[PDB]
């Protein structure tokens, strides 16, 4: 069964703001996702010091950027800690609620959208460039799941019967028609070099085709 949930009002409201505000500097969505991945890889690495069995789902700690012009997707892959079902449905949105208030407050005071990351809600910057985001994730303690939202105030969760991923997270950005620049190799390299040059894991930019 695919299950459908309502975002908290405040989260829905943030997402509409990100979709609706005029803001040209959309490229910062990629460092927000990569930094989420880097945080997630730090977590698993730390947890495995006191529990080496946590890496039985895979030792390699890395980030892949995968463009696909044919599906119009950019996918951000990591082998970090992953998320559980309770993360996806409840936990993450509960934390996200206060970062959302603070972010929204700071924007009136003239902070700008590029600062979303300081408020723990940088994931939603994905909606600057994506018409739909699909999140595939596998935590050690749990099953593999697919979360997916086109905003509009709802999200879905189902158990994923697709490829098994070992441990980690794929964020599949289904790009808006006029955002296909983020599928171009030189563009991605440029942004990674500009905003994400000091990440402590290998980041592989896959090329087509
Ligand atoms: C915000 C901290 C943790 C959530 N998280 C995120 C960011 C994130 C945050 C969310 O809430 C604020 C969120 O809920 C809609 C989310 O969706 C599945 C993701 Cl994807 N990315 C990763 C990742 N690559 N690996 C592990 N955990 C992640």
UniProtKB/Swiss-Prot annotation:
Chain spans, region Interaction with NR3C1: 1-209
Annotated source species: Homo sapiens
PTM (free text): ISGylated. S-nitrosylated; negatively regulates the ATPase activity and the activation of eNOS by HSP90AA1.
Modified positions (N6-acetyllysine) in chain numbering: 43, 69
Ranges in a coiled coil: none
Subcellular localization: Nucleus; Cytoplasm; Melanosome; Cell membrane
Subunit structure, as described in the record: Homodimer. Identified in NR3C1/GCR steroid receptor-chaperone complexes formed at least by NR3C1, HSP90AA1 and a variety of proteins containing TPR repeats such as FKBP4, FKBP5, PPID, PPP5C or STIP1. Forms a complex containing HSP90AA1, TSC1 and TSC2; TSC1 is required to recruit TCS2 to the complex. The closed form interacts (via the middle domain and TPR repeat-binding motif) with co-chaperone TSC1 (via C-terminus). Interacts with TOM34. Interacts with TERT; the interaction, together with PTGES3, is required for correct assembly and stabilization of the TERT holoenzyme complex.
Domain of life where this protein originates: Eukaryota
Protein family per UniProt: Belongs to the heat shock protein 90 family.
UniProt domain comment: The TPR repeat-binding motif mediates interaction with TPR repeat-containing proteins like the co-chaperone STUB1.
Protein's name in the database: Heat shock protein HSP 90-alpha
Annotated residues for binding of ATP: 36, 78, 97, 123
Protein task: Molecular chaperone that promotes the maturation, structural maintenance and proper regulation of specific target proteins involved for instance in cell cycle control and signal transduction. Undergoes a functional cycle that is linked to its ATPase activity which is essential for its chaperone activity. This cycle probably induces conformational changes in the client proteins, thereby causing their activation. Interacts dynamically with various co-chaperones that modulate its substrate recognition, ATPase cycle and chaperone function. (Microbial infection) Seems to interfere with N.meningitidis NadA-mediated invasion of human cells. Decreasing HSP90 levels increases adhesion and entry of E.coli expressing NadA into human Chang cells; increasing its levels leads to decreased adhesion and invasion.
